[PDB]
Amino acid sequence: TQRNETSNYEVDRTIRHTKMNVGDIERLSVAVVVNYKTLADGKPLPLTADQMKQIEDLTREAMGFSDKRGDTLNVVNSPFS
Amino acid sequence: TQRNETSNYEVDRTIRHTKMNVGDIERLSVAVVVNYKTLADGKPLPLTADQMKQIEDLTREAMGFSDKRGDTLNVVNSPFS
Amino acid sequence: IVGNGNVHAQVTAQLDFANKEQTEEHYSPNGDASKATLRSRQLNISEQV
Amino acid sequence: QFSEQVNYQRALEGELARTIETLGPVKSARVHLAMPSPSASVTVTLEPGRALDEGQISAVVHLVSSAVAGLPPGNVTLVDQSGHLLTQSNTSGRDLNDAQLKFANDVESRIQRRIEAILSPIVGNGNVHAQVTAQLDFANKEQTEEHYSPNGDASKATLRSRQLNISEQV
Amino acid sequence: QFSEQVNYQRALEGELARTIETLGPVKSARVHLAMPSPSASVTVTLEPGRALDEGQISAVVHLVSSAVAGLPPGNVTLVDQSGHLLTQSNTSGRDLNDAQLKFANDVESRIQRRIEAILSPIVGNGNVHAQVTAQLDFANKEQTEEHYSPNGDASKATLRSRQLNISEQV
Amino acid sequence: RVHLAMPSPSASVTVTLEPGRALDEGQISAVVHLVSSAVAGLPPGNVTLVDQSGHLLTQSNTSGRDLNDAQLKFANDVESRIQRRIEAILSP
Amino acid sequence: RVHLAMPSPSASVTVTLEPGRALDEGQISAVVHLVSSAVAG
């Protein structure tokens, strides 16, 4: 027996030619400090935990936070002067 | 027995040539704050869950929210100053 | 939320400024015979018994 | 020939100086050309008690640049009455790339205004604030696809030639 | 001949400046022309208490650009009586991919007005608000399809030539 | 009922026509020059005139890319023709 | 006020209409095609 087979193909092709931007944001680091108060007349007593969580969320969204870029955010509460 | 066969083909071809726009919105991150009230004269009290759900949906539609772009939305309810 | 002057934020912007080109060139696999696109084919099948 | 060009340049310099003088908070002007890569130098003395903004210097810069053939804005320099080289176009580094911030700010401002305009009627005029962060793709980007319909099936093939030899000896 | 050209050009500049002077809120103008890279600059001193919009500056740049051969509107600049570059195309980084934003604004505004106009008669004149966000495809896009009708079937194929040899020895 | 907003100024006029009338082409110029002049620093191109049912009498134009918005004008014309036909076949 | 660009030619006309009138869209084309066909090319 014999079997010869010459096969010529047409192939799909994609050519993307990108020229990346000059000045993109590789990574962002943000530090946020909030103040004590929390009362009408009493001594300041640290903003409650869920409130802190939502401030952290709001600044995370206003930053454009994306863990792919390695962005880092730190929010703390301490009395001012 | 023998069986020789030579075949020449005509093939469907599509050539789609795109030049992408410069300045497209890759990703959106939106943070929205809504004020307390809920009462004409009494103490301010958090807006109901269904209402906040509908503000979330309305701002989602106004943003142009799309899971493909990885858009992020965060709406919180807290009293103003 | 917290007041006019009860919050301070500082941001560091690590930025890239390297001129950066790229030229991808992708080809679809045609290993499977049911998705290949043939322009020509010469098939000889000889058999002697 | 030479003195003709000299007179013409020296007269047009005074002309553009006179025009620049009639620009509000400016007291005196002095335009100079470099005509054989063209270039221009303007010495503007602003009126005491005013200062043009960064997008305001571009006005006079491209006024004197486009008043002259072959002169891009970048070769035009301007010097205030006390130092203050207000034209950083000699570098020409981020001039293209500082307009990206303006465009992004415009985009996020439009989205923010839409959010406030749709949400204020429900919750109140001033009971809502929104901040929008828009990441943008400024990369020039081309693509050339080329797709072929498969013709492996004999019922969808399209033939131009076919030589089918069949032999059989018994 | 060089004096001929300069005096003709100066007369054209003065004439055009006088023509754009009689433009309502324009007290004085000053055309400057450069035909070697064609270019033109205008210094408009508007009448006090007015400001011409971007489409209102398009009028004058097309007026003074077409008055001289070979000069595109993009090389024509305008400067206000206090800086205020009225043409965006001066610092031409992109300066036109920001027109996509206002085009999208026009589209969204028309759709919003259509929804408001259809829904006002039912619920009331001011009992409804609509906000429209439009994603627009601004990318250049070409395509060249090429479809071939299959002729694998013998009763549908089209033959131009056919050489059929049949031999049989017994 | 004219509303103004001065923080780039702009204006929106919604004219209430008398029953059974519509402004001509030369009449919108009168109101645009009236509303533009009576306020300092507001160009006539920033005020948008709207009838009692759509029909933006003062159109907007483009400086940079003025081709794609002419498509908008053509679409507005086609929509207006079909709308007028529906109204003139349904009014009787 | 008509102006020509004669070396692709072009024309620029600054028409000041009388108070209390405004030409229609097909009426500006009148002067446009007049000044356009008053010049060769």
PDB file of N, CA and C in Angstrom, chain D residues 1 4-5 8 15-16 18-19 22-25 52 55-56 58-60 62-70 73 96 99-100 103 106-107 110 114 117-118 121 138 154-160, chain E residues 1-3 6 13 30-34 36-37 39-43 45 75 77 79-85 90-91 93-94 97-98 100-102 105 108 129 131-133 148-152:
ATOM      1  N   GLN D   1      17.425  92.794  -2.009  1.00  0.00           N
ATOM      2  CA  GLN D   1      17.024  91.418  -1.741  1.00  0.00           C
ATOM      3  C   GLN D   1      17.115  91.107  -0.250  1.00  0.00           C
ATOM      4  N   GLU D   4      15.503  93.874   1.805  1.00  0.00           N
ATOM      5  CA  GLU D   4      14.055  93.760   1.687  1.00  0.00           C
ATOM      6  C   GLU D   4      13.497  92.834   2.764  1.00  0.00           C
ATOM      7  N   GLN D   5      14.055  91.626   2.875  1.00  0.00           N
ATOM      8  CA  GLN D   5      13.610  90.703   3.915  1.00  0.00           C
ATOM      9  C   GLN D   5      13.841  91.293   5.299  1.00  0.00           C
ATOM     10  N   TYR D   8      11.118  93.743   6.051  1.00  0.00           N
ATOM     11  CA  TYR D   8       9.815  93.099   6.202  1.00  0.00           C
ATOM     12  C   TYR D   8       9.704  92.459   7.575  1.00  0.00           C
ATOM     13  N   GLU D  15       4.694  95.123  14.187  1.00  0.00           N
ATOM     14  CA  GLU D  15       3.262  94.905  14.009  1.00  0.00           C
ATOM     15  C   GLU D  15       2.716  93.944  15.061  1.00  0.00           C
ATOM     16  N   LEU D  16       3.343  92.771  15.190  1.00  0.00           N
ATOM     17  CA  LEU D  16       2.883  91.795  16.175  1.00  0.00           C
ATOM     18  C   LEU D  16       3.063  92.314  17.595  1.00  0.00           C
ATOM     19  N   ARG D  18       2.642  95.477  18.453  1.00  0.00           N
ATOM     20  CA  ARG D  18       1.479  96.340  18.627  1.00  0.00           C
ATOM     21  C   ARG D  18       0.215  95.531  18.885  1.00  0.00           C
ATOM     22  N   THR D  19       0.020  94.437  18.146  1.00  0.00           N
ATOM     23  CA  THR D  19      -1.150  93.593  18.382  1.00  0.00           C
ATOM     24  C   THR D  19      -1.132  92.972  19.770  1.00  0.00           C
ATOM     25  N   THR D  22      -2.286  95.205  22.615  1.00  0.00           N
ATOM     26  CA  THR D  22      -3.738  95.317  22.756  1.00  0.00           C
ATOM     27  C   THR D  22      -4.319  93.962  23.163  1.00  0.00           C
ATOM     28  N   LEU D  23      -3.913  93.515  24.360  1.00  0.00           N
ATOM     29  CA  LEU D  23      -4.394  92.243  24.891  1.00  0.00           C
ATOM     30  C   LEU D  23      -4.754  92.347  26.368  1.00  0.00           C
ATOM     31  N   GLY D  24      -5.248  93.502  26.804  1.00  0.00           N
ATOM     32  CA  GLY D  24      -5.711  93.666  28.161  1.00  0.00           C
ATOM     33  C   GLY D  24      -4.585  93.893  29.147  1.00  0.00           C
ATOM     34  N   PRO D  25      -4.403  92.946  30.083  1.00  0.00           N
ATOM     35  CA  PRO D  25      -3.381  93.072  31.134  1.00  0.00           C
ATOM     36  C   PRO D  25      -1.946  92.918  30.628  1.00  0.00           C
ATOM     37  N   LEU D  52      -1.048  86.042  33.562  1.00  0.00           N
ATOM     38  CA  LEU D  52      -1.745  85.100  32.697  1.00  0.00           C
ATOM     39  C   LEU D  52      -1.562  83.677  33.211  1.00  0.00           C
ATOM     40  N   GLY D  55      -2.768  78.117  30.505  1.00  0.00           N
ATOM     41  CA  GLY D  55      -3.481  78.062  29.243  1.00  0.00           C
ATOM     42  C   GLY D  55      -3.695  79.406  28.588  1.00  0.00           C
ATOM     43  N   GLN D  56      -3.267  80.482  29.245  1.00  0.00           N
ATOM     44  CA  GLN D  56      -3.322  81.825  28.687  1.00  0.00           C
ATOM     45  C   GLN D  56      -2.045  82.212  27.954  1.00  0.00           C
ATOM     46  N   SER D  58      -0.306  80.072  26.194  1.00  0.00           N
ATOM     47  CA  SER D  58      -0.427  79.388  24.911  1.00  0.00           C
ATOM     48  C   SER D  58      -1.131  80.259  23.881  1.00  0.00           C
ATOM     49  N   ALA D  59      -2.025  81.144  24.331  1.00  0.00           N
ATOM     50  CA  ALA D  59      -2.702  82.060  23.422  1.00  0.00           C
ATOM     51  C   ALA D  59      -1.699  82.892  22.632  1.00  0.00           C
ATOM     52  N   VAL D  60      -0.875  83.672  23.335  1.00  0.00           N
ATOM     53  CA  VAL D  60       0.112  84.511  22.662  1.00  0.00           C
ATOM     54  C   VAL D  60       1.153  83.654  21.945  1.00  0.00           C
ATOM     55  N   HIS D  62       0.858  80.685  20.408  1.00  0.00           N
ATOM     56  CA  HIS D  62       0.404  80.207  19.110  1.00  0.00           C
ATOM     57  C   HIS D  62      -0.143  81.346  18.257  1.00  0.00           C
ATOM     58  N   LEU D  63      -0.350  82.525  18.851  1.00  0.00           N
ATOM     59  CA  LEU D  63      -0.621  83.717  18.062  1.00  0.00           C
ATOM     60  C   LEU D  63       0.602  84.161  17.276  1.00  0.00           C
ATOM     61  N   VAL D  64       1.778  84.149  17.898  1.00  0.00           N
ATOM     62  CA  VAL D  64       2.986  84.587  17.206  1.00  0.00           C
ATOM     63  C   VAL D  64       3.570  83.434  16.400  1.00  0.00           C
ATOM     64  N   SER D  65       3.267  82.194  16.799  1.00  0.00           N
ATOM     65  CA  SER D  65       3.767  81.049  16.043  1.00  0.00           C
ATOM     66  C   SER D  65       3.036  80.885  14.716  1.00  0.00           C
ATOM     67  N   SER D  66       1.707  80.995  14.719  1.00  0.00           N
ATOM     68  CA  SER D  66       0.927  80.838  13.498  1.00  0.00           C
ATOM     69  C   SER D  66       0.856  82.116  12.677  1.00  0.00           C
ATOM     70  N   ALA D  67       1.371  83.226  13.201  1.00  0.00           N
ATOM     71  CA  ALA D  67       1.565  84.409  12.376  1.00  0.00           C
ATOM     72  C   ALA D  67       2.801  84.296  11.501  1.00  0.00           C
ATOM     73  N   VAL D  68       3.539  83.196  11.620  1.00  0.00           N
ATOM     74  CA  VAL D  68       4.818  83.009  10.953  1.00  0.00           C
ATOM     75  C   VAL D  68       4.817  81.646  10.273  1.00  0.00           C
ATOM     76  N   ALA D  69       5.338  81.596   9.049  1.00  0.00           N
ATOM     77  CA  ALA D  69       5.328  80.364   8.269  1.00  0.00           C
ATOM     78  C   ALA D  69       6.385  79.394   8.785  1.00  0.00           C
ATOM     79  N   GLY D  70       6.000  78.129   8.943  1.00  0.00           N
ATOM     80  CA  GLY D  70       6.933  77.085   9.311  1.00  0.00           C
ATOM     81  C   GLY D  70       7.353  77.064  10.763  1.00  0.00           C
ATOM     82  N   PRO D  73       4.542  76.051  17.548  1.00  0.00           N
ATOM     83  CA  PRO D  73       4.508  76.671  18.878  1.00  0.00           C
ATOM     84  C   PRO D  73       5.740  76.408  19.735  1.00  0.00           C
ATOM     85  N   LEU D  96       1.687  67.084  25.411  1.00  0.00           N
ATOM     86  CA  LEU D  96       0.690  66.134  24.931  1.00  0.00           C
ATOM     87  C   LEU D  96       0.103  65.321  26.076  1.00  0.00           C
ATOM     88  N   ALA D  99      -2.658  67.004  28.663  1.00  0.00           N
ATOM     89  CA  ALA D  99      -4.038  67.132  28.211  1.00  0.00           C
ATOM     90  C   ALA D  99      -4.845  65.873  28.494  1.00  0.00           C
ATOM     91  N   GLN D 100      -4.170  64.738  28.699  1.00  0.00           N
ATOM     92  CA  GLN D 100      -4.866  63.519  29.088  1.00  0.00           C
ATOM     93  C   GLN D 100      -5.574  63.689  30.423  1.00  0.00           C
ATOM     94  N   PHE D 103      -8.739  65.670  29.744  1.00  0.00           N
ATOM     95  CA  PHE D 103      -9.780  64.847  29.134  1.00  0.00           C
ATOM     96  C   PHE D 103     -10.404  63.896  30.152  1.00  0.00           C
ATOM     97  N   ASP D 106     -12.666  65.814  32.384  1.00  0.00           N
ATOM     98  CA  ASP D 106     -13.925  66.091  31.702  1.00  0.00           C
ATOM     99  C   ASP D 106     -14.847  64.879  31.741  1.00  0.00           C
ATOM    100  N   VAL D 107     -14.300  63.692  31.473  1.00  0.00           N
ATOM    101  CA  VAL D 107     -15.117  62.478  31.461  1.00  0.00           C
ATOM    102  C   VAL D 107     -15.729  62.231  32.837  1.00  0.00           C
ATOM    103  N   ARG D 110     -18.419  64.724  33.728  1.00  0.00           N
ATOM    104  CA  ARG D 110     -19.692  64.447  33.068  1.00  0.00           C
ATOM    105  C   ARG D 110     -20.438  63.317  33.765  1.00  0.00           C
ATOM    106  N   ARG D 114     -24.002  63.620  35.777  1.00  0.00           N
ATOM    107  CA  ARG D 114     -25.151  62.775  35.471  1.00  0.00           C
ATOM    108  C   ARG D 114     -25.675  62.080  36.722  1.00  0.00           C
ATOM    109  N   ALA D 117     -27.487  64.674  38.833  1.00  0.00           N
ATOM    110  CA  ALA D 117     -28.725  65.107  38.205  1.00  0.00           C
ATOM    111  C   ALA D 117     -29.799  64.032  38.195  1.00  0.00           C
ATOM    112  N   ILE D 118     -29.425  62.753  38.236  1.00  0.00           N
ATOM    113  CA  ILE D 118     -30.443  61.711  38.297  1.00  0.00           C
ATOM    114  C   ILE D 118     -30.824  61.407  39.744  1.00  0.00           C
ATOM    115  N   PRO D 121     -33.328  64.515  42.464  1.00  0.00           N
ATOM    116  CA  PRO D 121     -34.787  64.618  42.635  1.00  0.00           C
ATOM    117  C   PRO D 121     -35.348  63.684  43.692  1.00  0.00           C
ATOM    118  N   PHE D 138      -5.119  55.258  26.473  1.00  0.00           N
ATOM    119  CA  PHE D 138      -4.535  56.212  25.541  1.00  0.00           C
ATOM    120  C   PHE D 138      -3.553  55.555  24.579  1.00  0.00           C
ATOM    121  N   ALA D 154     -16.929  18.112   2.751  1.00  0.00           N
ATOM    122  CA  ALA D 154     -17.070  18.034   1.303  1.00  0.00           C
ATOM    123  C   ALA D 154     -18.352  18.682   0.801  1.00  0.00           C
ATOM    124  N   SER D 155     -19.332  18.899   1.675  1.00  0.00           N
ATOM    125  CA  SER D 155     -20.590  19.524   1.294  1.00  0.00           C
ATOM    126  C   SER D 155     -20.526  21.045   1.310  1.00  0.00           C
ATOM    127  N   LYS D 156     -19.436  21.626   1.815  1.00  0.00           N
ATOM    128  CA  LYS D 156     -19.293  23.076   1.831  1.00  0.00           C
ATOM    129  C   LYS D 156     -18.027  23.541   1.123  1.00  0.00           C
ATOM    130  N   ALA D 157     -17.310  22.648   0.449  1.00  0.00           N
ATOM    131  CA  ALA D 157     -16.111  23.028  -0.278  1.00  0.00           C
ATOM    132  C   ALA D 157     -16.474  23.723  -1.584  1.00  0.00           C
ATOM    133  N   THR D 158     -15.535  24.517  -2.089  1.00  0.00           N
ATOM    134  CA  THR D 158     -15.693  25.233  -3.352  1.00  0.00           C
ATOM    135  C   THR D 158     -14.483  24.914  -4.219  1.00  0.00           C
ATOM    136  N   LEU D 159     -14.709  24.198  -5.315  1.00  0.00           N
ATOM    137  CA  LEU D 159     -13.625  23.680  -6.137  1.00  0.00           C
ATOM    138  C   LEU D 159     -13.404  24.549  -7.367  1.00  0.00           C
ATOM    139  N   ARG D 160     -12.137  24.699  -7.753  1.00  0.00           N
ATOM    140  CA  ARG D 160     -11.769  25.375  -8.990  1.00  0.00           C
ATOM    141  C   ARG D 160     -11.248  24.385 -10.025  1.00  0.00           C
TER     142      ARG D 160
ATOM    143  N   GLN E   1       9.738  92.587  -7.060  1.00  0.00           N
ATOM    144  CA  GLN E   1       8.623  91.653  -6.944  1.00  0.00           C
ATOM    145  C   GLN E   1       8.339  91.328  -5.482  1.00  0.00           C
ATOM    146  N   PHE E   2       9.379  91.447  -4.665  1.00  0.00           N
ATOM    147  CA  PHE E   2       9.273  91.116  -3.250  1.00  0.00           C
ATOM    148  C   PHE E   2       8.505  92.209  -2.500  1.00  0.00           C
ATOM    149  N   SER E   3       8.713  93.472  -2.893  1.00  0.00           N
ATOM    150  CA  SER E   3       7.870  94.566  -2.413  1.00  0.00           C
ATOM    151  C   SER E   3       6.417  94.396  -2.840  1.00  0.00           C
ATOM    152  N   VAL E   6       4.894  91.802  -0.484  1.00  0.00           N
ATOM    153  CA  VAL E   6       4.698  92.210   0.906  1.00  0.00           C
ATOM    154  C   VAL E   6       3.553  93.207   1.011  1.00  0.00           C
ATOM    155  N   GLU E  13      -4.100  91.532   4.792  1.00  0.00           N
ATOM    156  CA  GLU E  13      -4.255  91.444   6.241  1.00  0.00           C
ATOM    157  C   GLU E  13      -5.136  92.569   6.769  1.00  0.00           C
ATOM    158  N   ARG E  30      -7.008  91.930  13.953  1.00  0.00           N
ATOM    159  CA  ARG E  30      -5.706  92.110  13.327  1.00  0.00           C
ATOM    160  C   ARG E  30      -5.234  90.813  12.683  1.00  0.00           C
ATOM    161  N   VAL E  31      -5.377  90.704  11.367  1.00  0.00           N
ATOM    162  CA  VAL E  31      -5.007  89.485  10.657  1.00  0.00           C
ATOM    163  C   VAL E  31      -3.512  89.492  10.375  1.00  0.00           C
ATOM    164  N   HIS E  32      -2.872  88.347  10.590  1.00  0.00           N
ATOM    165  CA  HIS E  32      -1.480  88.125  10.230  1.00  0.00           C
ATOM    166  C   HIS E  32      -1.380  86.838   9.428  1.00  0.00           C
ATOM    167  N   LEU E  33      -0.750  86.938   8.263  1.00  0.00           N
ATOM    168  CA  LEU E  33      -0.748  85.893   7.254  1.00  0.00           C
ATOM    169  C   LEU E  33       0.680  85.472   6.935  1.00  0.00           C
ATOM    170  N   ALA E  34       0.861  84.185   6.630  1.00  0.00           N
ATOM    171  CA  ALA E  34       2.186  83.647   6.333  1.00  0.00           C
ATOM    172  C   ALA E  34       2.066  82.577   5.256  1.00  0.00           C
ATOM    173  N   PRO E  36       4.733  80.913   2.741  1.00  0.00           N
ATOM    174  CA  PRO E  36       6.132  80.834   2.314  1.00  0.00           C
ATOM    175  C   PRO E  36       6.276  80.371   0.868  1.00  0.00           C
ATOM    176  N   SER E  37       4.210  76.016   4.145  1.00  0.00           N
ATOM    177  CA  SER E  37       3.642  76.021   5.488  1.00  0.00           C
ATOM    178  C   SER E  37       2.756  77.244   5.715  1.00  0.00           C
ATOM    179  N   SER E  39      -0.044  79.742   7.224  1.00  0.00           N
ATOM    180  CA  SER E  39      -0.507  79.974   8.589  1.00  0.00           C
ATOM    181  C   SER E  39      -1.145  81.351   8.756  1.00  0.00           C
ATOM    182  N   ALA E  40      -1.979  81.510   9.785  1.00  0.00           N
ATOM    183  CA  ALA E  40      -2.664  82.772  10.024  1.00  0.00           C
ATOM    184  C   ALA E  40      -3.020  82.912  11.498  1.00  0.00           C
ATOM    185  N   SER E  41      -2.976  84.154  11.975  1.00  0.00           N
ATOM    186  CA  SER E  41      -3.274  84.479  13.367  1.00  0.00           C
ATOM    187  C   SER E  41      -4.189  85.693  13.397  1.00  0.00           C
ATOM    188  N   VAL E  42      -5.154  85.695  14.319  1.00  0.00           N
ATOM    189  CA  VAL E  42      -6.072  86.816  14.499  1.00  0.00           C
ATOM    190  C   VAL E  42      -6.100  87.209  15.969  1.00  0.00           C
ATOM    191  N   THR E  43      -6.101  88.522  16.222  1.00  0.00           N
ATOM    192  CA  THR E  43      -6.184  89.091  17.569  1.00  0.00           C
ATOM    193  C   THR E  43      -7.497  89.865  17.657  1.00  0.00           C
ATOM    194  N   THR E  45     -10.438  91.756  19.563  1.00  0.00           N
ATOM    195  CA  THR E  45     -10.774  92.517  20.763  1.00  0.00           C
ATOM    196  C   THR E  45     -12.291  92.687  20.757  1.00  0.00           C
ATOM    197  N   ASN E  75      -4.433  75.831  10.832  1.00  0.00           N
ATOM    198  CA  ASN E  75      -3.302  76.728  11.020  1.00  0.00           C
ATOM    199  C   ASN E  75      -3.734  78.147  11.359  1.00  0.00           C
ATOM    200  N   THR E  77      -5.267  80.690  14.027  1.00  0.00           N
ATOM    201  CA  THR E  77      -5.461  80.824  15.468  1.00  0.00           C
ATOM    202  C   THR E  77      -6.238  82.107  15.745  1.00  0.00           C
ATOM    203  N   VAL E  79      -6.915  84.770  19.202  1.00  0.00           N
ATOM    204  CA  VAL E  79      -6.652  85.119  20.593  1.00  0.00           C
ATOM    205  C   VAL E  79      -7.627  86.210  21.007  1.00  0.00           C
ATOM    206  N   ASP E  80      -8.180  86.079  22.209  1.00  0.00           N
ATOM    207  CA  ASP E  80      -9.170  87.023  22.708  1.00  0.00           C
ATOM    208  C   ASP E  80      -8.461  88.283  23.201  1.00  0.00           C
ATOM    209  N   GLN E  81      -9.217  89.215  23.777  1.00  0.00           N
ATOM    210  CA  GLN E  81      -8.643  90.448  24.294  1.00  0.00           C
ATOM    211  C   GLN E  81      -8.009  90.266  25.668  1.00  0.00           C
ATOM    212  N   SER E  82      -8.167  89.091  26.284  1.00  0.00           N
ATOM    213  CA  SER E  82      -7.406  88.723  27.474  1.00  0.00           C
ATOM    214  C   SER E  82      -7.016  87.248  27.332  1.00  0.00           C
ATOM    215  N   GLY E  83      -5.880  87.012  26.680  1.00  0.00           N
ATOM    216  CA  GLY E  83      -5.434  85.652  26.408  1.00  0.00           C
ATOM    217  C   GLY E  83      -6.535  84.845  25.748  1.00  0.00           C
ATOM    218  N   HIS E  84      -6.930  83.754  26.409  1.00  0.00           N
ATOM    219  CA  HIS E  84      -8.145  83.007  26.082  1.00  0.00           C
ATOM    220  C   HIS E  84      -8.119  82.495  24.637  1.00  0.00           C
ATOM    221  N   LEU E  85      -7.188  81.574  24.398  1.00  0.00           N
ATOM    222  CA  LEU E  85      -7.099  80.867  23.121  1.00  0.00           C
ATOM    223  C   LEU E  85      -8.446  80.225  22.814  1.00  0.00           C
ATOM    224  N   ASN E  90      -4.680  74.441  18.709  1.00  0.00           N
ATOM    225  CA  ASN E  90      -3.355  75.047  18.791  1.00  0.00           C
ATOM    226  C   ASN E  90      -2.311  74.066  19.313  1.00  0.00           C
ATOM    227  N   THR E  91      -2.465  73.622  20.562  1.00  0.00           N
ATOM    228  CA  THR E  91      -1.542  72.659  21.165  1.00  0.00           C
ATOM    229  C   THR E  91      -1.996  71.246  20.799  1.00  0.00           C
ATOM    230  N   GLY E  93      -2.078  68.130  20.666  1.00  0.00           N
ATOM    231  CA  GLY E  93      -1.761  66.788  21.105  1.00  0.00           C
ATOM    232  C   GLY E  93      -2.783  65.826  20.541  1.00  0.00           C
ATOM    233  N   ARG E  94      -4.015  65.884  21.053  1.00  0.00           N
ATOM    234  CA  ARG E  94      -5.163  65.332  20.340  1.00  0.00           C
ATOM    235  C   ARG E  94      -6.173  66.429  20.029  1.00  0.00           C
ATOM    236  N   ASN E  97     -10.126  64.406  20.052  1.00  0.00           N
ATOM    237  CA  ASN E  97     -10.759  63.285  20.729  1.00  0.00           C
ATOM    238  C   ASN E  97     -11.534  63.744  21.954  1.00  0.00           C
ATOM    239  N   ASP E  98     -11.512  65.044  22.254  1.00  0.00           N
ATOM    240  CA  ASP E  98     -12.417  65.639  23.228  1.00  0.00           C
ATOM    241  C   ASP E  98     -13.730  66.091  22.597  1.00  0.00           C
ATOM    242  N   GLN E 100     -15.411  63.969  20.836  1.00  0.00           N
ATOM    243  CA  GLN E 100     -16.223  62.781  21.067  1.00  0.00           C
ATOM    244  C   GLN E 100     -17.090  62.934  22.309  1.00  0.00           C
ATOM    245  N   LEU E 101     -16.571  63.580  23.357  1.00  0.00           N
ATOM    246  CA  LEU E 101     -17.366  63.777  24.563  1.00  0.00           C
ATOM    247  C   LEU E 101     -18.598  64.628  24.290  1.00  0.00           C
ATOM    248  N   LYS E 102     -18.441  65.734  23.561  1.00  0.00           N
ATOM    249  CA  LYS E 102     -19.592  66.603  23.343  1.00  0.00           C
ATOM    250  C   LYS E 102     -20.530  66.017  22.292  1.00  0.00           C
ATOM    251  N   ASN E 105     -22.505  63.842  24.319  1.00  0.00           N
ATOM    252  CA  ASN E 105     -23.446  64.692  25.039  1.00  0.00           C
ATOM    253  C   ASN E 105     -24.650  65.031  24.173  1.00  0.00           C
ATOM    254  N   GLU E 108     -26.846  61.769  23.903  1.00  0.00           N
ATOM    255  CA  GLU E 108     -27.565  61.521  25.148  1.00  0.00           C
ATOM    256  C   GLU E 108     -28.627  62.582  25.392  1.00  0.00           C
ATOM    257  N   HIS E 129     -37.801  62.601  35.118  1.00  0.00           N
ATOM    258  CA  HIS E 129     -36.470  62.928  34.631  1.00  0.00           C
ATOM    259  C   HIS E 129     -35.806  61.660  34.117  1.00  0.00           C
ATOM    260  N   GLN E 131     -31.968  60.187  32.486  1.00  0.00           N
ATOM    261  CA  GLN E 131     -30.554  60.391  32.210  1.00  0.00           C
ATOM    262  C   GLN E 131     -30.053  59.232  31.366  1.00  0.00           C
ATOM    263  N   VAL E 132     -29.361  59.549  30.276  1.00  0.00           N
ATOM    264  CA  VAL E 132     -28.931  58.562  29.297  1.00  0.00           C
ATOM    265  C   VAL E 132     -27.412  58.565  29.236  1.00  0.00           C
ATOM    266  N   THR E 133     -26.814  57.388  29.392  1.00  0.00           N
ATOM    267  CA  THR E 133     -25.379  57.195  29.224  1.00  0.00           C
ATOM    268  C   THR E 133     -25.162  56.392  27.950  1.00  0.00           C
ATOM    269  N   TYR E 148     -17.987  32.475  -1.202  1.00  0.00           N
ATOM    270  CA  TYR E 148     -17.998  31.594  -2.360  1.00  0.00           C
ATOM    271  C   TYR E 148     -19.086  30.549  -2.187  1.00  0.00           C
ATOM    272  N   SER E 149     -19.954  30.435  -3.186  1.00  0.00           N
ATOM    273  CA  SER E 149     -21.007  29.432  -3.117  1.00  0.00           C
ATOM    274  C   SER E 149     -20.429  28.046  -3.395  1.00  0.00           C
ATOM    275  N   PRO E 150     -20.644  27.087  -2.496  1.00  0.00           N
ATOM    276  CA  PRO E 150     -20.083  25.748  -2.703  1.00  0.00           C
ATOM    277  C   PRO E 150     -20.656  25.085  -3.945  1.00  0.00           C
ATOM    278  N   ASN E 151     -19.796  24.354  -4.654  1.00  0.00           N
ATOM    279  CA  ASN E 151     -20.196  23.603  -5.836  1.00  0.00           C
ATOM    280  C   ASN E 151     -19.805  22.133  -5.718  1.00  0.00           C
ATOM    281  N   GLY E 152     -19.804  21.602  -4.494  1.00  0.00           N
ATOM    282  CA  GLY E 152     -19.559  20.183  -4.316  1.00  0.00           C
ATOM    283  C   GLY E 152     -20.619  19.320  -4.966  1.00  0.00           C
TER     284      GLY E 152
END
